[PDB]
Amino acid sequence: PMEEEEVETFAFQAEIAQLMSLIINTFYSNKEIFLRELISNSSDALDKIRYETLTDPSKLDSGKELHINLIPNKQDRTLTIVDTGIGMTKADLINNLGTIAKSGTKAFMEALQAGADISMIGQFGVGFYSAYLVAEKVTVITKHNDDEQYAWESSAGGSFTVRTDTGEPMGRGTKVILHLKEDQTEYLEERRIKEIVKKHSQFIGYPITLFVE
Numbered sequence: 001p002m003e004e005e006e007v008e009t010f011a012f013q014a015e016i017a018q019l020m021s022l023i024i025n026t027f028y029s030n031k032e033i034f035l036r037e038l039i040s041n042s043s044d045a046l047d048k049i050r051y052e053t054l055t056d057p058s059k060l061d062s063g064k065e066l067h068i069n070l071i072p073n074k075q076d077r078t079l080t081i082v083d084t085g086i087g088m089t090k091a092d093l094i095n096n097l098g099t100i101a102k103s104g105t106k107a108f109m110e111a112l113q114a115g116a117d118i119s120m121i122g123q124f125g126v127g128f129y130s131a132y133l134v135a136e137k138v139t140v141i142t143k144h145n146d147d148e149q150y151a152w153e154s155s156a157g158g159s160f161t162v163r164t165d166t167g168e169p170m171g172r173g174t175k176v177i178l179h180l181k182e183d184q185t186e187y188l189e190e191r192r193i194k195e196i197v198k199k200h201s202q203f204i205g206y207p208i209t210l211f212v213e
Contacts, residue, residue, distance in 0.1 A: 007163045012098045012154075015105040016129075020156045022109055023132045028118045034134050035187070036200035037127035038081045038176055039208070042068050045085025045174060046206050052086065062145055062172035068208040070197075072188040077180050079134075079187055084173040087144035090162065093152045097140065098160050102126055132156060134187055135178040143170045 012020065046066045053059045063084050071080040088096060104124030111120055121130050131138050140152035149170060154160035186192050190212045197208060 003166075005163060005166065007161055009159050009161050010094060010099055011159050013101045015101060015109070016098055016126075017156075017158045019105050019109055019126060019129055020132055020158075022112060023118075023129055024156055026112070028133060030117050030119050031133040031184070032187075032192075032196045033119045033121070033200065034130040035081075035193070035196045037122060037130045039068060039197070039201045039204060040122065041128060042081065042083030042085055042174065043204050043206060045083055045087070048086040049084075049172070059145055062143075066206050068204065068206055070193060070208060070210045072190070072193060072210075072212065074185075074188050074213065077182075077185065077188065079178045079180060079193075081176045081178075082170075082173065083175075084171070087170075087172050087174055088140075088142040088150070089144040089147035090150050092144065093140070093142060093150055093162055097128065097152055098154075131176065131178055134180055134184040136181045137179040139177040139179070141165055141167070141170060141175040141177070143172050143174075145172060 011017075046068075049059060050066060066084055069082040071082065072078075073080070102125055105126055108121065108124040108126055111124075112118065118130060118133065121127050137155040138153065141149065142152070143149040149165040149167075151163050151165040151167070152160060180187060187196075190210060193210055197210075201208070
Protein backbone atom coordinates (compact mmCIF):
# COMPACT_ATOMS: atom_id res chain seq x y z
CA PRO A 1 0.00 0.00 0.00
CA MET A 2 3.04 2.29 0.52
CA GLU A 3 3.86 3.53 3.97
CA GLU A 4 4.86 7.06 4.92
CA GLU A 5 7.69 7.61 7.41
CA GLU A 6 8.87 10.82 9.04
CA VAL A 7 12.54 11.78 9.04
CA GLU A 8 14.36 14.73 10.55
CA THR A 9 17.77 15.93 9.43
CA PHE A 10 20.02 17.74 11.87
CA ALA A 11 23.33 19.55 11.64
CA PHE A 12 26.22 18.47 13.86
CA GLN A 13 27.38 21.13 16.31
CA ALA A 14 30.17 23.20 14.68
CA GLU A 15 33.09 21.81 16.65
CA ILE A 16 31.66 18.29 16.42
CA ALA A 17 31.55 18.52 12.60
CA GLN A 18 35.16 19.77 12.56
CA LEU A 19 36.16 16.86 14.81
CA MET A 20 34.51 14.44 12.42
CA SER A 21 36.27 15.95 9.39
CA LEU A 22 39.54 15.66 11.33
CA ILE A 23 38.91 12.02 12.28
CA ILE A 24 37.91 11.16 8.71
CA ASN A 25 40.49 13.08 6.70
CA THR A 26 43.66 12.55 8.72
CA PHE A 27 45.77 9.40 8.97
CA TYR A 28 45.88 7.84 12.44
CA SER A 29 47.87 4.82 13.52
CA ASN A 30 46.07 3.31 16.53
CA LYS A 31 42.60 3.02 14.93
CA GLU A 32 41.74 -0.31 16.60
CA ILE A 33 40.80 1.75 19.71
CA PHE A 34 37.37 2.62 18.19
CA LEU A 35 36.09 -0.71 19.55
CA ARG A 36 37.22 0.05 23.12
CA GLU A 37 35.22 3.28 22.95
CA LEU A 38 31.99 1.70 21.74
CA ILE A 39 32.27 -1.17 24.25
CA SER A 40 32.92 1.41 27.06
CA ASN A 41 29.79 3.25 26.02
CA SER A 42 27.83 0.04 26.26
CA SER A 43 29.25 -0.76 29.71
CA ASP A 44 28.16 2.71 30.87
CA ALA A 45 24.63 2.15 29.46
CA LEU A 46 24.44 -1.29 31.14
CA ASP A 47 25.48 0.25 34.47
CA LYS A 48 22.68 2.78 34.15
CA ILE A 49 19.89 0.23 33.59
CA ARG A 50 21.33 -2.02 36.33
CA TYR A 51 21.33 0.76 38.96
CA GLU A 52 17.93 2.01 37.85
CA THR A 53 16.51 -1.49 38.29
CA LEU A 54 17.56 -1.43 41.96
CA THR A 55 14.81 1.11 42.64
CA ASP A 56 12.39 0.02 39.88
CA PRO A 57 12.57 -3.69 38.89
CA SER A 58 9.91 -3.27 36.20
CA LYS A 59 12.62 -1.51 34.17
CA LEU A 60 13.85 -4.99 33.29
CA ASP A 61 10.50 -6.02 31.78
CA SER A 62 12.13 -5.10 28.47
CA GLY A 63 14.80 -7.77 29.09
CA LYS A 64 16.82 -8.88 32.12
CA GLU A 65 20.10 -10.02 30.51
CA LEU A 66 22.81 -7.41 30.61
CA HIS A 67 25.35 -8.20 27.91
CA ILE A 68 27.31 -7.07 24.85
CA ASN A 69 27.30 -8.84 21.45
CA LEU A 70 29.77 -8.30 18.61
CA ILE A 71 28.54 -9.22 15.13
CA PRO A 72 30.95 -9.02 12.17
CA ASN A 73 29.39 -9.43 8.72
CA LYS A 74 31.80 -10.12 5.86
CA GLN A 75 29.09 -10.06 3.18
CA ASP A 76 27.71 -6.69 4.28
CA ARG A 77 31.03 -5.35 5.50
CA THR A 78 29.41 -4.22 8.74
CA LEU A 79 30.52 -4.56 12.38
CA THR A 80 27.58 -4.29 14.81
CA ILE A 81 27.95 -3.66 18.55
CA VAL A 82 24.75 -4.47 20.46
CA ASP A 83 24.12 -3.89 24.18
CA THR A 84 21.07 -4.39 26.40
CA GLY A 85 21.81 -1.17 28.25
CA ILE A 86 19.49 1.70 29.16
CA GLY A 87 19.06 2.84 25.52
CA MET A 88 18.38 6.35 24.27
CA THR A 89 15.12 8.30 23.90
CA LYS A 90 14.61 10.50 20.84
CA ALA A 91 15.79 13.55 22.79
CA ASP A 92 18.81 11.57 24.06
CA LEU A 93 19.84 10.68 20.51
CA ILE A 94 19.54 14.26 19.25
CA ASN A 95 21.16 15.91 22.25
CA ASN A 96 23.79 13.27 23.05
CA LEU A 97 24.88 12.36 19.55
CA GLY A 98 25.66 15.50 17.58
CA THR A 99 23.52 18.47 18.49
CA ILE A 100 24.84 19.72 21.86
CA ALA A 101 28.39 21.07 22.23
CA LYS A 102 30.88 18.92 24.17
CA SER A 103 33.41 20.68 26.42
CA GLY A 104 36.31 18.45 25.42
CA THR A 105 36.05 18.72 21.61
CA LYS A 106 38.21 21.83 21.29
CA ALA A 107 40.95 20.60 23.63
CA PHE A 108 40.89 17.31 21.81
CA MET A 109 41.34 18.67 18.29
CA GLU A 110 44.14 20.78 19.70
CA ALA A 111 45.85 17.67 21.12
CA LEU A 112 45.68 15.75 17.83
CA GLN A 113 47.15 18.75 15.98
CA ALA A 114 50.13 18.55 18.35
CA GLY A 115 50.48 14.83 17.58
CA ALA A 116 48.47 13.04 20.29
CA ASP A 117 47.46 9.41 19.62
CA ILE A 118 43.68 9.15 18.94
CA SER A 119 43.50 6.74 21.88
CA MET A 120 43.30 10.02 23.88
CA ILE A 121 39.75 10.52 22.54
CA GLY A 122 38.28 8.66 25.51
CA GLN A 123 39.41 11.21 28.10
CA PHE A 124 37.73 14.09 26.22
CA GLY A 125 34.19 12.68 26.20
CA VAL A 126 34.03 12.44 22.39
CA GLY A 127 34.84 8.71 22.03
CA PHE A 128 31.78 7.79 19.91
CA TYR A 129 33.25 9.65 16.93
CA SER A 130 36.26 7.28 16.82
CA ALA A 131 33.82 5.03 14.96
CA TYR A 132 34.60 7.21 11.92
CA LEU A 133 38.21 6.02 11.99
CA VAL A 134 37.04 2.76 10.41
CA ALA A 135 33.48 3.49 9.26
CA GLU A 136 32.16 5.61 6.42
CA LYS A 137 28.62 5.47 7.75
CA VAL A 138 27.31 4.67 11.23
CA THR A 139 23.75 3.68 12.16
CA VAL A 140 22.52 3.72 15.77
CA ILE A 141 19.39 1.74 16.56
CA THR A 142 18.20 2.46 20.06
CA LYS A 143 15.30 1.68 22.35
CA HIS A 144 14.63 3.22 25.77
CA ASN A 145 11.83 2.21 28.18
CA ASP A 146 10.37 5.74 27.95
CA ASP A 147 10.24 6.02 24.17
CA GLU A 148 9.68 4.19 20.90
CA GLN A 149 12.64 2.73 18.95
CA TYR A 150 14.68 5.20 16.88
CA ALA A 151 17.29 5.11 14.13
CA TRP A 152 20.16 7.65 14.04
CA GLU A 153 22.49 7.87 11.05
CA SER A 154 25.14 9.84 9.16
CA SER A 155 27.95 9.46 6.64
CA ALA A 156 29.34 12.54 8.35
CA GLY A 157 29.44 15.50 5.97
CA GLY A 158 27.92 17.73 8.66
CA SER A 159 24.42 16.29 9.21
CA PHE A 160 22.70 13.27 10.70
CA THR A 161 19.13 11.97 10.40
CA VAL A 162 16.75 10.66 13.04
CA ARG A 163 13.57 8.64 12.45
CA THR A 164 11.28 6.22 14.28
CA ASP A 165 12.48 2.72 13.54
CA THR A 166 9.98 0.42 11.84
CA GLY A 167 12.65 -2.31 11.63
CA GLU A 168 13.30 -5.29 13.96
CA PRO A 169 12.31 -4.35 17.57
CA MET A 170 15.15 -4.54 20.14
CA GLY A 171 13.42 -4.76 23.52
CA ARG A 172 15.88 -2.33 25.17
CA GLY A 173 19.43 -1.22 24.46
CA THR A 174 21.59 0.25 21.70
CA LYS A 175 22.91 -1.21 18.43
CA VAL A 176 25.81 0.49 16.63
CA ILE A 177 26.21 -0.60 13.04
CA LEU A 178 29.47 0.31 11.39
CA HIS A 179 29.54 0.33 7.60
CA LEU A 180 33.31 -0.15 7.34
CA LYS A 181 35.51 1.53 4.75
CA GLU A 182 37.02 -0.88 2.21
CA ASP A 183 40.54 -0.71 3.70
CA GLN A 184 39.32 -1.48 7.24
CA THR A 185 37.93 -5.00 6.75
CA GLU A 186 40.44 -6.52 9.22
CA TYR A 187 37.93 -5.57 11.90
CA LEU A 188 35.56 -8.19 10.52
CA GLU A 189 38.04 -10.95 11.35
CA GLU A 190 37.46 -12.95 14.51
CA ARG A 191 41.16 -13.15 15.36
CA ARG A 192 41.55 -9.38 15.10
CA ILE A 193 38.42 -8.61 17.11
CA LYS A 194 39.43 -10.97 19.91
CA GLU A 195 42.89 -9.33 19.90
CA ILE A 196 41.46 -5.86 20.43
CA VAL A 197 39.04 -6.97 23.13
CA LYS A 198 41.80 -8.82 25.05
CA LYS A 199 44.05 -5.78 24.77
CA HIS A 200 41.69 -2.90 25.59
CA SER A 201 38.34 -4.15 26.86
CA GLN A 202 39.28 -6.89 29.30
CA PHE A 203 37.80 -5.26 32.43
CA ILE A 204 34.22 -4.98 31.25
CA GLY A 205 31.73 -5.78 33.98
CA TYR A 206 29.37 -7.59 31.59
CA PRO A 207 29.87 -10.56 29.28
CA ILE A 208 30.73 -9.98 25.63
CA THR A 209 29.95 -12.66 23.00
CA LEU A 210 31.36 -12.64 19.47
CA PHE A 211 29.02 -14.23 16.94
CA VAL A 212 31.05 -15.50 13.98
CA GLU A 213 29.37 -16.48 10.72
